[PDB]
Write a protein that binds this ligand. Sequence first.
Ligand SMILES: [Mg+2]
Ligand SMILES: [Mg+2]
Ligand SMILES: [Mg+2]
Ligand SMILES: [Mg+2]
Ligand SMILES: [Mg+2]
Ligand SMILES: [Mg+2]
Ligand SMILES: [Mg+2]
Ligand SMILES: [Mg+2]
Ligand SMILES: [Mg+2]
Ligand SMILES: [Mg+2]
Ligand SMILES: [Zn+2]
Lengths: 166, 110, 46, 295, 153, 51, 144, 87
Amino acid sequence: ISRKWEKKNKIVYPPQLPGEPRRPAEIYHCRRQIKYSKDKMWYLAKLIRGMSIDQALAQLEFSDKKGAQIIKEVLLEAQDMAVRDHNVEFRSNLYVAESTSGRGQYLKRIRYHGRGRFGIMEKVFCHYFVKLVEGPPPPREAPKTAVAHAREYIQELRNRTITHAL
Amino acid sequence: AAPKNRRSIEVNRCRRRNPQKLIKVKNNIDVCPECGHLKQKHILCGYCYEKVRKETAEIRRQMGKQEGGPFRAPTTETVVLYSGETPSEQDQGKRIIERERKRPSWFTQN
Amino acid sequence: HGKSVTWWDEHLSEENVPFVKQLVSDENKAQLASKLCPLKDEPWPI
Amino acid sequence: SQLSPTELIEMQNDLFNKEKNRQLSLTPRTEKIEVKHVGKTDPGTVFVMNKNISTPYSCAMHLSEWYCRKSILALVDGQPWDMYKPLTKSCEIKFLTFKDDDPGEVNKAYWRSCAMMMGCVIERAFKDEYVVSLVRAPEVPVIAGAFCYDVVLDKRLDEWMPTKENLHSFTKDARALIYKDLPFETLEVEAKVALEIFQHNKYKLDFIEEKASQNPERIVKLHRFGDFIDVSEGPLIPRTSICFQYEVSAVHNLQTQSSLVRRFQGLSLPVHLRAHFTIWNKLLERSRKMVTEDK
Amino acid sequence: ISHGRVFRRLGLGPESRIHLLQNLLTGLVRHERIEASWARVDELRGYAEKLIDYGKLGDTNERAMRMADFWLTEKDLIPKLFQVLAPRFQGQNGGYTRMLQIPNRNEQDRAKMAVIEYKGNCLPPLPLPRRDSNLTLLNQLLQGLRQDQEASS
Amino acid sequence: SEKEFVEHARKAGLVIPHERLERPIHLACTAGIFDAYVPPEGDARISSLSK
Amino acid sequence: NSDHDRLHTLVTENCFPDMVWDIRYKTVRWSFVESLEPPQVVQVRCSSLMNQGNIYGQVTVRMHTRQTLAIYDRFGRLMYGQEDVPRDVLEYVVFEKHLVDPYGSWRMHGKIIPPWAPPKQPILKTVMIPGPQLKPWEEFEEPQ
Amino acid sequence: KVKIFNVTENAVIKPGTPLYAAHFRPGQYVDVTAKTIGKGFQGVMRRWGFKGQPATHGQTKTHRRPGAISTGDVARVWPGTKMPGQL
RNA sequence: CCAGCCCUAGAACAGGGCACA
Ligand SMILES: [Mg+2]
Ligand SMILES: [Mg+2]
Ligand SMILES: [Mg+2]
Ligand SMILES: [Mg+2]
Ligand SMILES: [Mg+2]
Ligand SMILES: [Mg+2]
Ligand SMILES: [Mg+2]
Ligand SMILES: [Mg+2]
Ligand SMILES: [Mg+2]
Ligand SMILES: [Mg+2]
Ligand SMILES: [Zn+2]
């Protein structure tokens, strides 16, 4: 197996020089061997990507999925860790920077079919990884406007060269 | 029918990452002005409803302990009073349940 | 800015809902009665 | 005096920042205050805050984002308190939103903030060759359909009144001002420094003197968002983006014995309490009328 | 095509749906407040209103008596229906029940759940959704409009 | 088909394996302080003068 | 310097955890600038246990020291105090030594702080103290 | 409901005018346009009036199917193929 | 504008209504 999301939380940075902007705190947390499915957990992980922690908890409280409670507990433990261990005041000043889900070790069973046939049934397990960064959530990217489209097209036209001409 | 070829990860992602399959965000979430917990604008508050449900379960437990039988239902109205309360002139003649707990702030005397 | 969904009855009070209803009703009645005589205000050439 | 409007705004902001730096340096050390939370939701909560640095907005940030989004005003144990005002001593805080049972204080604060924003729009939506002097913001109740602001224009401007196009341009400027998030900053200063802050508006000087005469310490409250500074009573809302709907309803010229004043009346509704289109039109038609409340 | 259908299919058929609604009505008459699925409670509300009307029809009415005998499975609730529920619903016309959607069931099915309650019961009042006060900004503006309209007449 | 998981980390020590240790625990120090010195409240004012 | 070996040789097993546990994930910048009052031996005690025949001699020494302490965060930001302020501290270090041991090095055992000592310097950040997390069937009780 | 009517240039009326049923007189022929009664996703027998297979003479799970939909040589089905859908 | 609630609209999503009463 591999356990690096946990050790990602033990790196220490050198002290900051007077004048350098304050580095935002990054908190890595994870839950291993969840009975939920990998893709069904990826859906809930994608739901709460880039959102504030309070908004993510508000969405997960009313999500009807089973992994919603697991992700909510993981987010709450990550907030508690960020407040206690790391020097992070304003416990509501965290946003979900990274939120993905990986697979775990499966359990192989037999699924009977009929006429003496069977199938390989896989009891699936998943991991949920989350990363909380101190600060306001980054603004959502807006779709490209017509002015930007026209600018990019004009620049593409201006970048042309006479090919195989020299 | 059997599949003719293996579907690639590209088409698989295009299928199961379409916004039709993504979880939609809910915009009807608000806070409860009483306890501060989260609730939907069209649904009762879970915390307050749990409080009321626990109080109702206790009241029903006591009112069922009062009636030693399964088919013994009162033919008159019922009134629940808490510690330090007395039945009024309008509440007399009804069945009386007495709770040792003090009257909650949300339960109105009426 | 996560703006929430709103309708016309969310922020109204127990006393302003009937007032709003009757106000819109009287406005609609007046507007429908104003157009009852179309041939005397400014009709187009027949 | 030979002073450009941009130079006047620059010097006003410079003296404001100097007074703010003096207020900050008045406290050399970092004292810890213990502020309780007497709200109905989470009682018994205690915040160990910094003296003259931490704010009720910082308390709300410690609590939850829902508090920062909903709570507009704060009640520090005896009186309303805006979110971006640093706390002074150990106290107890109660947060106040728009949908409270007695939201009168928040209504007054929102009315004052809307009046201040409208005055900021009017002061800068006019020609530089003309003189424009804001008198004050008449404290009208919320039952009145509009918030009013008193202006005095150049002498050669007393014959014309703004048309619907001009009112729409004022509304567009106010919406553009709302678009950019500008927090309302407060400052407890003295009349001595407020006089040199303004130094040009005789009406503003008279208002500052009248507000300082009723105070035994001669302390007046200045408010500033972006580059606009104004004197007003009571606290304000934390941000401008709280104002969702905003319209400049009308202007009314009142001619007195000494001079005439243009009362600009406008209407606004928050993001939390935005109304339907027809309701907004009815309220706007009511606000188009005259509002006369001074004492 | 289910145009103009008013009853939803429940249980193992029409008779099973009738029996389910009958059990729910018996429980509602007994406890004055129950909680079930949203669809079953929405189907039961009309039967509860009609049962209160049949109870208001009187004790000596043989039709109402046999209707109560059929519906109320526990036979100790018929005197209750005729001497507690019907007498206390006299000035009212159709406002006998109150149905409110409660959060989804905490079980794995996550069923949409409602709570039905006979008005005027001896139970803690549910957290009913109260409208905003007249002291709100918008409500005060509408009050000013109303006062102007009153003064204009 | 019949397979299970392993490595369920649990910490459970009992008095029997605690006392059946072949060699005692060698301690290079004690637990805490036996006789704590309670200083007089006038140290802040007597530290101002040397003699 | 995070020299756990020499730290174990200097301080004892009761002094090591209390000074390494809450700091193993932080950066320290500690220095020694001045000392107004020389250290003074206050009292000397000895604990003799006859079950093994072992004697531990503890010596309390009062120190008036002038130190500069700056505890940084695991991300590099200042947490506790500045690295240039020479704060004055008064402590009572209790050293201990096993007298039966042939080597018997002098090791710092405990750190007594008087109860009337001035409170420590305030932290740079703010703290929220949560109230009692209430169950639905429980009501808040305001203490006065 | 908001509809558009193609009129001549001499039969134009001012916008905002009311229109009444006496616009039509007893004895006249009219055209009536409306959205018909929607029966949802209906089968081929109710949508196109196709005949089904016999009821019980051996047929297995086909009593309402459309049957053959195209020809073997075309190796595809034509766009004008009658198939179940909205009705 | 679309939270919710009805529908002669609908597999889901969509679509029409929710002031007279
Ligand atoms: Mg077999
Ligand atoms: Mg498989
Ligand atoms: Mg396979
Ligand atoms: Mg249909
Ligand atoms: Mg046939
Ligand atoms: Mg066959
Ligand atoms: Mg068959
Ligand atoms: Mg067969
Ligand atoms: Mg072909
Ligand atoms: Mg619609
Ligand atoms: Zn609640």
